[PDB]
């Protein structure tokens, strides 16, 4: 029921001149937007990516981001000159911004910044702040960034008002895609070293249940791997069971998933 909306920015600064900024946007585990460095405009990756924004509202929003990208790029470059020679290129910066949507018109917005792959800075309330563990030198950038009242007011409106509204509309518009059910297909294999593998692929959404079973006995030696993505926005998972050779017969792989609607997949070795 709870969906997290994530705008993810990746910025690489190799030297004083060369830089690139790339962005992707997620609603839950579905990609809604893409913004390549090479592109002047934000790309929709779904038909419903504009949500319930009118063309005029979207154009105004995109323009704000266009100004931001150019500005952010110059700001980092200038902050590097300002801290010289404490910090140096290359520099990787990541931004994670968005809002978590709760039922009954509740939401929490966030804007987190990582420097060289470490969370250092967030926007909180009405200002930028460092987080615990952040280096002291960041106090000067924070002081400069907090001097810009215009950015502060813009971000506040962006986090407090724009995000929750936009996402509410996204949830309405993308309802059918968010609630789609895709059936998993399973298959079995084995690698002697023996280890039995149960492959489960093509399922959506993410929640799934996979256990190796002898009859009705749950084999506690089952090791669930990570969730791996397919290209078609479905998921892949495998569960491995370590067995003694000769004791194969009797083992089955049971898969429960919401898309099957009661009809569990059972595959006997």
């Amino acid at each position: 029921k709870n969906y997290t909306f994530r705008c993810l920015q990746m910025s690489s600064f190799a030297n004083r001149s060369w830089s690139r900024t790339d962005s992707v946007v997620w609603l839950g585990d579905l990609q809604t937007h893409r913004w390549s460095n090479d592109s002047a405009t934000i790309s929709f990756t779904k038909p419903w990516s504009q949500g319930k924004l009118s063309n005029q509202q979207w154009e105004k929003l995109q323009h704000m981001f266009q100004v931001y990208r150019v500005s952010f790029t110059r700001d980092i470059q200038e902050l590097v000159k300002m801290m010289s020679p404490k910090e140096d290129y290359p520099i990787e910066i990541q931004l994670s911004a968005g809002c978590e949507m709760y039922p009954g018109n509740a939401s929490e917005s966030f804007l987190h910044v990582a420097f060289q792959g470490k969370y250092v800075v967030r926007f909180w309330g009405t200002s930028w702040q460092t987080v615990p563990g952040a280096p002291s030198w960041l106090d000067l950038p924070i002081k400069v960034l907090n001097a810009d009242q215009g950015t502060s007011a813009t971000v506040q409106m962006l986090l407090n008002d724009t995000c929750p509204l936009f996402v509410r509309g996204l949830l309405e518009a993308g309802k059918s895609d968010l609630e789609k059910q895709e059936k998993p297909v399973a298959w079995l294999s084995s690698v002697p070293s023996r280890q039995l593998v149960c492959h489960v692929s093509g399922f959506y959404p993410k929640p799934v249940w996979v256990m190796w079973m002898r009859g009705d006995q749950e084999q506690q030696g089952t090791h669930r791997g990570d969730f791996l993505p397919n290209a078609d926005e479905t998921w892949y998972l495998q569960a491995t069971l370590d067995v003694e050779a000769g004791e194969e017969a009797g083992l089955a792989c049971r898969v429960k998933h919401s898309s099957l609607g009661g009809q569990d997949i059972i595959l006997y070795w």
Epitope: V67, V70, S71, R74, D75, E78, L79, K81, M82, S84, K143, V144, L145, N146, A147, D148, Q149, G150, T151
Partner: T-cell receptor
Framework: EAAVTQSPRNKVAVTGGKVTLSCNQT?????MYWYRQDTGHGLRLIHY???????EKGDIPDGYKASRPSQENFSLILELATPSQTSVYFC??????????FGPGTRLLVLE | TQVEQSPQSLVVRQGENCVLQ??????????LRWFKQDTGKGLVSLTV?????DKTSNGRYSATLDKDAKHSTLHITATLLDDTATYIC?????????????FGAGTQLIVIP
């Protein structure tokens, strides 16, 4: 209240000669900026500084060198003066805010 | 140049009002400042406009800013001899020291006493 001083206020120099324009500020501002003003143009940024030991190229840095030996002092150095550097030079300082506080200006004439 | 001023120059008689204008293409446009510069002197800040549709006043000086149009005017009411000067429009692209200033070339005003 935040005052900036420039010296000298007026200078006659020869081509190939060395000229140093000095800027002093007692406001404890990190940031200092050198500009030149020429007819038919707005003020154009030559060099700036974010602190002691720091100098940065502006829009038109060619033929100029900058020097920030201390927080108080920002120098503009013309190693080999040319007539094209005949101009009025303005220094400014500021903190983290957007306001720049301008000095009274320096008139430079480079004769052949 | 991203900041253009009009008129280039003008002559008015004491007691008359005049309008000076500034058109810019600076992006972004955090704020706009008007300077008075007496001949052979420094820059005296007259006003700073910051809002989308801003209006300011400073004695006989008043100014408007329209960010949508990227246009500003400075009004001088009841000119005096001492208004004889160059009026310079400056746009700042940031609300902080990370900003660059964009200077107009100015408007020369002469007031005949």
């Amino acid at each position: 209240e935040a005052a900036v001083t420039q010296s000298p206020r007026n200078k006659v120099a020869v081509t190939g000669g060395k000229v140093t324009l000095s800027c002093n500020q007692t406001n404890n501002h990190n940031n200092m900026y050198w500009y030149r003003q020429d007819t038919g143009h707005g003020l154009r940024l030559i060099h700036y500084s974010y602190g002691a030991g720091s100098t940065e190229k502006g829009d038109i840095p060619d033929g100029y060198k900058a020097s920030r030996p201390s927080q108080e002092n920002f120098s503009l150095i013309l190693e080999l003066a040319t007539p094209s550097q005949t101009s009025v030079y303005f220094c400014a300082s500021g903190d983290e805010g957007y306001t720049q506080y301008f000095g009274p200006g320096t008139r430079l004439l480079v004769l052949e | 140049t991203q900041v253009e001023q009009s008129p280039q120059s003008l002559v008015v008689r004491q007691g008359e009002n005049c309008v000076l204008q500034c058109n810019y293409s600076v992006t972004p446009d955090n704020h706009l400042r008007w300077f008075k510069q007496d001949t052979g002197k420094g820059l005296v800040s007259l006003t700073v406009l910051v809002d989308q549709k801003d209006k300011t006043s400073n004695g006989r000086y008043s100014a408007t800013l329209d960010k949508d149009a990227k246009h500003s005017t400075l009004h001088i009411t009841a000119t005096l001899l001492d208004d004889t000067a160059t009026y310079i429009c400056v746009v700042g692209d940031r609300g902080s020291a990370l900003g660059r200033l964009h200077f107009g070339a100015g408007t020369q005003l002469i007031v005949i006493p």
